[PDB]
Amino acid sequence: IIGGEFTTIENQPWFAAIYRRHRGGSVTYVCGGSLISPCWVISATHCFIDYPKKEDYIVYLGRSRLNSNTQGEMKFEVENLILHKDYSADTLAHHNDIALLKIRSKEGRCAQPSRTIQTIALPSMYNDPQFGTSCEITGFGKEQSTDYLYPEQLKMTVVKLISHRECQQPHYYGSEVTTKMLCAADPQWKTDSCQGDSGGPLVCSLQGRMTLTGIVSWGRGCALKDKPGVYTRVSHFLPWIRSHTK
């Protein structure tokens, strides 16, 4: 997250932190995710495609720090890693960049809700907020595009939904952006998602309800003028989600 503020997991308690084990046994951060039910985390396929063995991944919930344990956290193995069959990678865009991880403890349990661990509701189908709506993003991704390190403390910021019309302009992303993606950005381009934030939540208020409107997917650089954050449009994937989680 470029700009924004530091936060803790109580302000985004559906946030899942996903890590990968190495043959070395070094364990490193991969991507965010969102808890949509006790046993299921939703994330982005591009995070996992190069390394698609489920045994390779660890999932934390209730975690506010990247390389230290948060009081109350839960650690899980990945029982099922479901990547979207129609996924693809352009030069920049990822299509169908959505993934599901079924989580289970060493002890066989899914997540137990608590003050630091809650699910996030899915949107109704084809039901997104109006353009210009303010939503929030959360992640352990880079604070500057050129940083080598990820931040140790979870971050969040606010971005505004951009219309497809505007995001499809050639000085924005042209064709790269499809109806299955949402664009979001700062009017001053001063705050944004970045590398390491992929898979994480774009959350908006609709109804009276915090709703997983988007999943961090791609962008041309970070907090760069005329280059919004691009997000998977969750409300265009409900049958895929339900089919793979029933």
Ligand SMILES: N=C(N)NC(=O)c1nc(-c2ccco2)c(N2CCCCCC2)nc1N
């Ligand atoms: N909101 C945005 N403007 N951008 C992003 O959301 C975003 N950006 C990058 C990125 C970092 C530097 C240039 O681009 C990035 N990367 C690094 C490139 C390799 C592919 C996936 C990981 N992932 C992202 N999700």
